[PDB]
């Protein structure tokens, strides 16, 4: 049936595994190929001295080796506009 009208789950083709949610300005990891939030993937490598990838569990990656997944960022932007994905910010 149809999805996206009032409900729809974010696909893994544009959803960060680290926070299990969509990301903006997503990057790619040259250790495996998965894409996540720039900050999310950075945190994984920063907190892991072994540079343990948060998906393939690699031990030779780097937050400086993060490439720009143009396609990812594009899809996310379109997806957000189709289903109208967004959230309510606060005055924190």
Q: Which residues bind its own copies (CB under 8 A)?
A: 11-14, 27-35, 65, 67-75, 78
Supply the minimum distance, in Å, between the C-beta of residue 77 and Zn ion: 16
Supply the minimum distance, in Å, between the C-beta of residue 15 and its own copies: 8
Nearer residue to Zn ion within complex by CB, 1 or 89: 89
| Cα dist from 37 to 4, 5, 7, 28, 32, whole Å | 23, 26, 23, 9, 15
Nearer residue to its own copies within complex by CB, 48 or 73: 73
Query: If you write DSSP's letter for every residue of 29-64 in order, what string do you get?
Result: -TTT--EE-HHHHHHHHHH-TT---TTT--SS--TT
- Binding piece for Zn ion, criterion CB under 5 A, among 4-12, 31-39, 42-50, 68-76: 31-39
């Amino acid at each position: 049936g149809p999805l996206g009208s009032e409900d729809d789950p974010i696909p893994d083709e544009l959803l960060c595994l680290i926070c299990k949610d969509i990301m903006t300005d997503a990057v790619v990891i040259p250790c495996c190929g998965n894409s996540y939030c720039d900050e999310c993937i950075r945190t994984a490598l920063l907190e892991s001295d072994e540079h343990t990838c948060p998906t393939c569990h690699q031990n030779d990656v780097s937050p400086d080796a993060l490439i720009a997944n143009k396609f990812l960022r594009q899809a996310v932007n379109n997806f957000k506009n189709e289903t109208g994905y967004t959230k309510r910010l606060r005055k924190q």
